[PDB]
Amino acid sequence: DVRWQQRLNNYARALQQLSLAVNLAQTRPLSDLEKQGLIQAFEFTHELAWNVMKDYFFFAGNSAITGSRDATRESFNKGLIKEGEIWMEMIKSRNQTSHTYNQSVADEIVKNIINFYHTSFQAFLEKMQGLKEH
Amino acid sequence: VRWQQRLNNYARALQQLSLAVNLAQTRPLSDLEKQGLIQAFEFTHELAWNVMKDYFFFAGNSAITGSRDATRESFNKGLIKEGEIWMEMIKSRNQTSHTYNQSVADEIVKNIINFYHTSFQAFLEKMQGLKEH
Numbered sequence: 001d002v003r004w005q006q007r008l009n010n011y012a013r014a015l016q017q018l019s020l021a022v023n024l025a026q027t028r029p030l031s032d033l034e035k036q037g038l039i040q041a042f043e044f045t046h047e048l049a050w051n052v053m054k055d056y057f058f059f060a061g062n063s064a065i066t067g068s069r070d071a072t073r074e075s076f077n078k079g080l081i082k083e084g085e086i087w088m089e090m091i092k093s094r095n096q097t098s099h100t101y102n103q104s105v106a107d108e109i110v111k112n113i114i115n116f117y118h119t120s121f122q123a124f125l126e127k128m129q130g131l132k133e134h
Numbered sequence: 135v136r137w138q139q140r141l142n143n144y145a146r147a148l149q150q151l152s153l154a155v156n157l158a159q160t161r162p163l164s165d166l167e168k169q170g171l172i173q174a175f176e177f178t179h180e181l182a183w184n185v186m187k188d189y190f191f192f193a194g195n196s197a198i199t200g201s202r203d204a205t206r207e208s209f210n211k212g213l214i215k216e217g218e219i220w221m222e223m224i225k226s227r228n229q230t231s232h233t234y235n236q237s238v239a240d241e242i243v244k245n246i247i248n249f250y251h252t253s254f255q256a257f258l259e260k261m262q263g264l265k266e267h
């Protein structure tokens with residue numbers, strides 16, 4: 001039923017595609033359309049991240065988690081993530097998705113993806129990969 | 135509460151989607167650009183069905199809550215004619231979390247280019263005619 005290590009496998013696959021786009025941005029500016037794609041990749045990577053969180057705490061007997069905010073708070077309190085505000089900012093970015101046809105909105109989410117979220121995603125991957133081995 | 139204002143933003147969003155759909159006619163899209171085409175479809179469809187919901191609110195219909203509700207009412211009243219296509223857009227929306235699978239991304243992209251963009255343009259013209267009354 002609930003299998004947090006399988007969810008982690010898909011999270012890694014999604015993050016690898018986000019990493020491709022984040023690396024591309026270091027070689028040249030992204031077009032407006034590529035920025036929309038970077039946002040889409042952030043969205044499917046973040047969605048998997050907090051569902052890994054939810055799945056992991058279900059094993060611990062926690063059935064009270066229902067969304068990304070609940071999952072992010074429990075992860076911070078249990079030490080799975082260190083940058084609590086950044087992970088909460090990700091949720092704000094998710095809630096701005098419908099408005100990214102405004103370049104100011106798209107550009108803000110892209111700057112956060114490149115300068116903060118990707119690093120946090122990689123740290124969470126490494127954290128959970130260690131816990132799986134245990 | 136203002137369906138004509140919602141329609142202004144819908145047109146702005148559709149203009150951005152149109153740019154990507156025309157780009158796809160000049161060359162293949164990269165994997166990343168495909169993701170960006172899907173994101174543009176998402177913000178265009180979200181505005182579309184909220185225009186529907188706003189419009190029917192003026193008629194006294196406060197029962198509409200989501201995109202399926204809005205889409206059915208729009209088909210019932212003639213605002214849209216391709217009912218099955220507009221419902222397929224909702225299935226595409228619900229696949230958004232899985233577009234890191236190239237098969238999923240490619241399927242949504244093909245639907246956007248071959249069907250959804252045409253339907254979006256028709257709905258724009260339909261509502262633009264209703265704004266003039």
Ligand SMILES: [Mg+2]
Binds near residue numbers: 039040043172173230
């Ligand atoms: Mg999206």
